[PDB]
């Protein structure tokens, strides 16, 4: 084949001359001096080259393992720190450790009804009321004419007038997995080593986990999943564009399916199967170039995505299985924690869980009626619902099962004596965090501390405290976001304009009808920070860059594949290295022990006094320790 | 003019940077090397990057390697004139054209399908029978289901639009559609063998339990188009206006609601931000060449939105005719892997065969409802006047058994120069390869049962579990050729997006119009839901419990997540499982741990459940990945 | 654990005997040498093994950097080549370089109204007007009866009859990021080195970037992102299939919600929570052992996707930020472009920006009302809209601000002095390209030129010039496609079927209503080429293969995990190296300088003289370059 194509161009890259010279010389040497067995193996010839159809052997070192199990340590449920696990020396080494919890089923206490035509308000910072049987708009402003008739949430179970019962739907919070573990701390002999919070694990969910292993993390921490959908076949006309003044006499309305000069219609003959939208008998072959006919009424199918899980409001939430993973330096690449130079005892884990108040919301189950106003003859019907969410009390369900599977690594009894008496160092990566508060809506500043080890990574964000304020209706739905989230409700209306009058062919201002079901929300997130600057002792280490440079490009290019991009453009990222966790060998670091001073400045358009903002910052401080 | 520049953060070290930098060692070495190469008469007193790379890893310097010349050319091997679709329709030979082998691809063309002309149910009462169940539209408006006193209804039969049919006197055709993912269903058995020595072999279960655990989240559409599966295209919508609704603060503004007018005076959220980022100036009135700063508390007013609609097309939609598909198939071996494989320098002429046992027709193609038995157009008095509810009505019977047309076996090679082709023609060498195992088994004992594993003799370093209920494979089920590759009890969740047309021509009596209404429908809509079956896994060998009992979601979603090495996706359907006795699960070529089943001839798999029984059993499939090597000659 | 299961088959792969022999020999050596460490360390054992619970170190050389900034070179606005940047001598090396451009907001030219039911035609390749106030269909045919009014797109703000004003919506082009830079060029001291065009940037977006960073790319190059949506809860009637005739209810309208067969109820009643579809009391347990039925009214929540961004049609587009990356051999893996031995200055870029007439379209701003006919009582009303407009969006928005963020690589002044007097060659990659025109609808061929350097890469795509044709109404929205696209319109109507007659229970042919809002499109692509053939001087390199081979298998299997697959089946790809741009080492190449002749043939079904086609070809050549 084309393998004899070389010369002055690819000579240096190929080295065919030196290769053949080496082969001939080694063949002569082996035939004359050595054993009478020419044509050596792929070891001597592969000394000044690189062959492809070959491999490199390496006697594998022995190792085994078995997934262990550890129970809690007599921990009260969710109220306090519901766990303090141990490290029982079952195996020999340590590795990843996963938590396990089963949240109890939640219910809803029986609620009352709006006894009279006007009941007192109060369920949030605001509330609603349905006044005087539709005669008024909202407690005043007498409208033209309207009426009220109470409905119920899950469909149309019409509730009797102002005296009945109605429960309240209960739904969990989005991403409830990494909300329970509000704080973690792993200490040996009392010396705390690493830790994080509910913010660091939120600043890693967007970055570390690649898009390949997505459904795993989406089903492991009790997050709702988007199940596929389908439908039946629905006919749709197909319309192409040919040319101007070529086949455009006029657009057809009810007849004359002709006057269409094609665009090489054999191209649209075997691709869309245009001869089979009709019930009449069709041959088992093609139908070529009919009179002004290229493609007619292809078959199209629609898709209706849906979901089902904890985020769907139901009268009874079944007990989910919210797995939680511990991300440390031991729960990383095994290329860790020998667990043999540590004596028996003084090895604990502290997990300060959260409360039940910020995990179980409610949903309105009343749906105060809509003012079916008849504005004279035109616009006869009209329905616009408004929730009537007088509160309930949820329940006191708590977790019952708690486990921590801690796999180990076994070692043969021969290797088990050389590393137990000696001491060995190793470079590990840990977490640091120092969150603060901010103000000064103008071009403010701040300062960073609690960072003393050499740093080769970073993270910046800006979480408004308004998102964590318990009085917000979307506190337990959009808390992990990183921006001022606004809702844009819509209305998938169902227009029905029918006129029974056989005469009066003018506009139908006599008989019309509108309707609706429920509002539809969309989480719209916006960025907050507009500029970023990192200075240290006068010299500006990183010039003023916009948001979309530290939020989109730096995560895009750096890290290769092991770093995705945040779906929200608010999360920042700063890197002082070339291999941000994609590799193990260090790729530089801006030291902090020698540079005490440090700064982070930024402009804003949302900080101030009414809507404050508490930024968060993490890091991966390279630091090496000694075992014994 | 040889001073320092901006003096960036590079002269910053200390107590924790010495070990990582070793600037003292670097300076000592570079100075000694400079003195050495200047003491021996060199015109370049500075050493290149060769002398400093002894114990340092520099980034701005590559490393060359003379690339040994190789090439390839996609050959083409027609079949062995085997039988059509019914029997094993292929046993491909091997031409000694090149010198090596690599990944191989199948190819197949499926003929066109049609429908057999039927007759309309001329009489208002017909005999049933098209599946395990059937129905009839009775008496043209007298009965609900073949007998019931019903007040009012009309049953006029009427697929692809509104094809109205004269009263019970016409014909019709049956819509035809293929099965989802036919590429993993056609090839039912593959067995590579030389000189009659069968080496590799698997079944139609490895082709399913690798599709979810080999391809990453990037080649999704690539595979979907390779195996001729339906694809999802994007769409747009007409520009429509949508309202906006922001929450400002508590008690900062107490405007409850106004029906028609007076929408203003609401607590603000630092307006300048919400104005610029939204540009609230949807209006026809004059819009100047700049942005307007908050006319009246205009934080967010009338944001613009556009919807998105998905759509589909291909072999997975019911049509009266199907163009010839092209179902490319791969051959998952150890040769269709990293480029070594199949030296083919000591293999004689011939004596290299493949075998591909195809499937039949009755397990791929089905029919589809075309009649759409008339809806119960009931008139329930004044309230809920109109009401529509369609229903299918089959009339099966068709063959159209067009089989696999021209089908090749595109296969590459690795040509070598005639010089190298003599140094490895006489030598013999081994290489650790991977060969798949499979031992299916039927099961019973609904309670916490167990089993015994067999058909496993090689040292094993990988594992698969699964549980596919036989109801999915039972051809008498009306949902077999749509959700057959699932690994859990599938259930359909029909719904109906009705039309609420509540018109009231009554000019007075503004109260509840309980006299006129309208309900409608179009067609059914399904939702395949997957629910796992296995609740625990406990693999044991020689009595000692090697792996304790673990929930399904630990062996389904987590164990491919923490492991895998960015090369193992996670299954959508949680029914699949996975166990690993190594550290590099197929991501690396070097083995990373394996337990031996040759010396330990005992092996057990125990699992509790609540779905097995007698009315619907379940057959579990188990794959593997052996680690065994071969020799040349 | 079970790790002592040795034998005779795993000898070659474990070498436990040789491991024990080596460790015993080194132990006896250490004991006879008189050392206080009788056990050997991890140093002498790794000669013929590979430990897994251990890592390797590498003393790293220090290196810093800082993202600099360069301004334009007083070039023209978007009309001409709006930039020719330079290089500042602030750093010591080169690396990835991102541009930055913003586009000022636009406006709309106020137009008049169609004063009468007949006016002048001509507003695009095709045009039309609203006819005869409803008497006719195109002012040339009697019709039953209708009436024509006007409406604005954003809703239905009924326009006064044939007397008002209106604007025209302004919407940007799809993927404006890879459309500005029509031609790039990099040259040092006049000598040109590499270049590309918009075709190469559109043939590298579908292949190079993995599927993970798609979210980042969509925000980088300014494309609307499909933000997730939610909806309200609604019940669905679940209905499973048990067995053939095991229990045979035919059908029922409203009753008989039982009597189906069993499917091991404890399993099918514990995963759907049958205790929360009803208002009646729900105990603190399940509802096990009910009358035989699989499930009872599961809860479902739909998901509505929604899009927003510069691609949506509005009246005023805020200033976007079209970030653009530059793909070279310098903006790639730095494991480049020293520019230390290069003199100061004398190195520029060139960016021939595109035009403004092909980046902004218009949208119809006055929809002619539909044929509101009255065809008797049944199917009386009917609405189907049609567009109507008048261009004039020639407004002069242009790119005001421009920068070029170039990072560097600072070196310690100790390494900076060893290679400042030396020259080094290194294998690099460029982007050759040669576009051409074609004809001969039948099984034609062509010739390839401007390719002489050794090639280890390829791309082929047949793009019909009907798309980029100026008069195409969909040109600046669907231009990045590689196939003849056809629009498949639909109509999600809303029906109304009411019988006003309280008696006469016959079919509701007394009142029937139709409606519509706006058409909906779904761009579908189709491949043109059916076979490929690459020959050179008689021999055949690649046999005739279907389009689905060089487009969906070769990129699939090759490239590893760094090459996505094209969603559009039009683009193809040929490889001549075993590693298609996955690694850095060369892995195959056919020199095309020794063999000057070259041919690329292909069948077709769309070429001709009505809609011609032009094939695009890129590559990645290899040719090392020297500094001094």
Report yes or no: B378 at the C interface, CB cutoff 8 Å.
yes
Two tokens at A265?
A: 């219609």
* Contacts across the B-C interface (CB distance below 8 Å): 358
Q: Which long-range contacts (CB under 8 A, 24 or more apart) does A368-371 make?
A: A368/A128, A368/A129, A368/A130, A368/A148, A368/A150, A369/A130, A369/A134, A369/A147, A369/A148, A369/A149, A369/A150, A369/A151, A370/A516, A371/A134, A371/A137, A371/A143, A371/A146, A371/A147, A371/A148, A371/B259
Residues of A in Cβ contact (< 8 Å) with C232: 517-520
Helices (H), B534-601: 552-553, 559-562
Going across the sheet that includes B197-203, the strands are: B197-203, B189-194, B356-357
* Contacts across the A-B interface (CB distance below 8 Å): 362
| CA distance linking residue C267 with residue A155, whole number of Å | 27
3-state secondary structure of C166: strand
User: Contact, A101 vs A85, CB < 8 A?
Assistant: no
Give the chain B residue whose CA is nearest to the CA of C408.
Answer: B8
C181-217 core/surface letters (b: 16 or more CB in 10 A; e: else): beebbbebeeeebbbbbbbbbbbbbbbebbbbbbbbb
Burial class, A177, CB count within 10 angstroms (exposed 0-12 / middle 13-18 / buried 19+) = buried
User: Contact, B173 vs B395, CB < 8 A?
Assistant: no
Which residues have a Cβ under 8 Å from the Cβ of C230 and sit 6 or more positions away? A520, A521, A522, A523, C301, C303, C304
Four-CA torsion B444, B450, B452, B456, nearest 10 degrees: 100
Two tokens at C413?
A: 């002044």
Domains identified in chain C and CATH numbers: 1-57 (no CATH), 61-111+166-224+316-357+397-422 (2.70.9.10), 229-245+265-276+292-304 (no CATH), 424-483+527-628 (2.70.9.20)
Among residues A579, A592, A329, which one has the least CA distance to residue B17?
A592
For residue B347, count other CB atoms closer than 10 A to its CB: 17
Smallest Cβ distance to B304: which of C5, C314, C498? C314
Q: Measured between CA atoms, how close is C343 to chain A, in angstroms?
A: 26
Geometric angle at alpha carbon C34, from C30 and C36, rounded to 5°: 85
Report yes or no: C416 at the A interface, CB cutoff 8 Å.
no
For residue A424, count other CB atoms closer than 10 A to its CB: 13
Report yes or no: A140 at the C interface, CB cutoff 8 Å.
no
Backbone angles phi, psi at C32, to 5 degrees: -70, -25
Which of B518, B532, B541 should be substituted to probe chain C, the one whose Cβ sees the most C Cβ atoms within 10 Å?
A: B518
Q: Tell me if A273 and B7 make a contact (CB, 8 A cut-off).
A: no
Residues of B in Cβ contact (< 8 Å) with A594: 12-14
What is the Rg, in whole angstroms, of the alpha carbon atoms belonging to chain B?
35
Smallest Cβ distance to B73: which of C5, C336, C542? C542
A471-502 core/surface letters (b: 16 or more CB in 10 A; e: else): ebebbbbbbbbbbbbbbbebbebbbbbbbbee
Instruction: Kindly list the partner chains of chain A, i.e. chains with 3 or more CB atom pairs below 8 Å.
Output: B, C
Q: What counts of helices (H) and strands (E) characterise chain A?
A: 7, 18
Q: Measured between CA atoms, how close is A32 to chain C, in angstroms?
A: 31
Q: Tell me if B429 and A41 make a contact (CB, 8 A cut-off).
A: yes
Report yes or no: C440 at the B interface, CB cutoff 8 Å.
no
Proportion of chain C in helix, strand, coil states, percent, rounded to 5: 10, 20, 75
Report yes or no: C237 at the A interface, CB cutoff 8 Å.
no
Cα B273 to chain center, whole Å? 43
Give the chain B residue whose CA is nearest to the CA of C428.
Answer: B62
* Contacts across the A-C interface (CB distance below 8 Å): 341
Q: What is the resolution of the experimental data for this entry, in Å?
A: 4.1
Residues of C numbered 186-205 whose beta carbons fall under 8 angstroms of chain A's beta carbons: which are they? none
Report yes or no: C22 at the A interface, CB cutoff 8 Å.
no
| CA distance linking residue B573 with residue C396, whole number of Å | 54
Give the chain B residue whose CA is nearest to the CA of A499.
Answer: B505
Q: Return the biggest CA–CA distance within chain B.
A: 116
Residues of A numbered 564-593 whose beta carbons fall under 8 angstroms of chain B's beta carbons: which are they? 578, 585-587, 589-591, 593
User: Contact, C132 vs C140, CB < 8 A?
Assistant: no
The strand pairing partners of B545, in sequence order, are B540
Residues of C in Cβ contact (< 8 Å) with A587: 60
User: Contact, B306 vs B236, CB < 8 A?
Assistant: yes
A374-412 core/surface letters (b: 16 or more CB in 10 A; e: else): beeeeebbbbbbbbbbbebebbebebeebbbbbbbbbbe
Q: Measured between CA atoms, how close is C137 to chain A, in angstroms?
A: 8
DSSP state of A266: G
Q: Tell me if C454 and A60 make a contact (CB, 8 A cut-off).
A: no
Q: Measured between CA atoms, how close is B133 to chain C, in angstroms?
A: 6
Q: Tell me if A518 and C63 make a contact (CB, 8 A cut-off).
A: no
Q: Measured between CA atoms, how close is C96 to chain A, in angstroms?
A: 9
Smallest Cβ distance to A552: which of C137, C220, C585? C220
| CA distance linking residue A467 with residue A476, whole number of Å | 9
- Following DSSP, what letter does each residue of B19-35 receive, concatenated? HHH-HHHHHHHHHHHHH
Q: Tell me if C295 and B216 make a contact (CB, 8 A cut-off).
A: no
Among residues B434, B389, B415, which one has the least CA distance to residue B584?
B434
Smallest Cβ distance to C62: which of B21, B156, B282? B21
3-state secondary structure of A267: helix
Residues of A in Cβ contact (< 8 Å) with B71: 1-3
Residues of C in Cβ contact (< 8 Å) with B627: 13
The terminus-to-terminus CA distance of chain A in angstroms comes to 63
| CA distance linking residue C460 with residue C463, whole number of Å | 10
Report yes or no: C423 at the B interface, CB cutoff 8 Å.
no
Which residues have a Cβ under 8 Å from the Cβ of C176 and sit 6 or more positions away? C221, C222, C310, C320, C322, C359
Give the count of alpha carbons within 13 A of A325, CB side only. Answer: 27
The strand pairing partners of A266, in sequence order, are none
Q: Measured between CA atoms, how close is A444 to chain C, in angstroms?
A: 23
Residues of B numbered 70-109 whose beta carbons fall under 8 angstroms of chain C's beta carbons: which are they? 70-76, 103, 105
């Amino acid at each position: 084949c084309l393998i004899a194509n070389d010369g002055k161009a690819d000579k240096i890259i190929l080295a065919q001359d030196l290769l053949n010279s080496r082969i001939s010389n080694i063949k002569n040497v082996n035939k004359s001096y050595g054993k009478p067995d020419p044509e050596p193996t792929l070891s001597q010839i592969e000394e000044t080259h690189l062959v492809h159809f070959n491999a490199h052997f390496k006697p594998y070192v022995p190792v085994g393992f078995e997934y262990n199990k550890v129970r809690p340590h007599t921990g009260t449920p969710t109220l306090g720190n519901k766990l303090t696990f141990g490290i029982p020396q079952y195996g020999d080494f340590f590795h990843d450790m996963v938590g396990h919890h089963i949240l109890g089923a939640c219910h809803s206490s029986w609620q009352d009804a709006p006894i009279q035509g006007t009941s007192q308000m109060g369920a949030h910072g605001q509330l609603q009321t349905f006044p005087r049987n539709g005669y008024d708009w909202d407690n005043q402003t007498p409208l033209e004419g309207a009426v009220y008739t109470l409905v119920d949430p899950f469909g149309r179970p019409i509730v009797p007038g102002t005296k009945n019962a109605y429960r309240n739907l209960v739904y969990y919070c989005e991403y409830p997995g990494l909300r329970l573990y509000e704080n973690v701390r792993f200490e040996v002999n009392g010396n705390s080593l690493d830790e994080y919070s509910s913010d660091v694990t939120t600043l890693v969910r967007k970055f570390c986990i690649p898009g390949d292993k997505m459904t795993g993390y989406k089903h492991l921490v009790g997050q709702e999943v988007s199940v596929e959908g389908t439908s039946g076949p629905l006919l749709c006309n197909i319309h192409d564009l040919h040319k101007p003044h070529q086949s455009k006499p006029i657009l057809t309305d009810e007849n004359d399916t002709q006057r269409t000069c094609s665009h090489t219609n054999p191209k649209f003959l075997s691709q869309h199967f245009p001869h089979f939208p009709e019930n009449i008998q069709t041959a088992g072959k093609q139908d070529i170039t009919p009179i002004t006919d290229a493609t007619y009424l292809d078959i199209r199918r629609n898709v209706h995505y849906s979901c089902n899980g904890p985020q769907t409001p139901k009268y009874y939430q079944p007990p989910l299985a919210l797995w939680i993973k511990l991300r440390f330096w031991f729960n990383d690449n095994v290329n860790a924690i020998p667990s043999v130079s540590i004596p028996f005892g003084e090895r604990f884990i502290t997990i300060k869980l959260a409360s039940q108040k910020d995990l179980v919301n409610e949903f309105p189950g009343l749906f105060v009626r809509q003012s079916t106003v008849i504005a004279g003859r035109p616009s006869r019907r009209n329905i616009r619902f408004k929730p009537w969410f007088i509160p309930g009390v949820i329940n006191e369900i708590s977790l019952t099962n708690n486990e921590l599977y801690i796999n180990n690594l076994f070692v043969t009894p021969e290797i088990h004596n050389l590393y137990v008496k000696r001491v060995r160092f190793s470079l590990i990566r840990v977490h640091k965090t120092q969150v603060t508060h901010t103000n000064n809506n103008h071009h403010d500043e701040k300062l960073m501390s609690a960072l003393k080890w050499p740093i080769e990574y970073m993270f910046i964000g800006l979480k408004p405290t308004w998102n964590i304020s318990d009085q917000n209706p979307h506190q337990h739905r959009d808390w992990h976001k990183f921006g001022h989230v606004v809702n844009a409700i819509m209305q998938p209306t169902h227009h029905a304009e029918i006129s029974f009058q056989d005469r009066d062919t003018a506009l139908p201002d006599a008989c019309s009808s509108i309707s609706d079901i429920s509002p539809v929300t969309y989480p719209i997130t916006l960025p907050i920070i507009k500029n970023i600057s990192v200075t240290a002792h006068g010299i500006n280490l990183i010039d003023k860059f916009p948001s979309q440079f530290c939020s989109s490009y730096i995560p895009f290019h750096y890290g290769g594949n092991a770093i995705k991009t945040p779906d929200d453009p608010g999360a920042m990222m700063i890197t002082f290295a070339l291999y941000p966790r994609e590799e193990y060998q260090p790729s530089g670091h801006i030291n902090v022990s020698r540079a005490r001073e440090f700064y982070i400045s930024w402009d804003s358009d949302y900080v101030g006094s009414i809507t404050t903002a508490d930024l968060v910052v993490s890091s991966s401080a390279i630091n090496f320790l000694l075992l014994q």
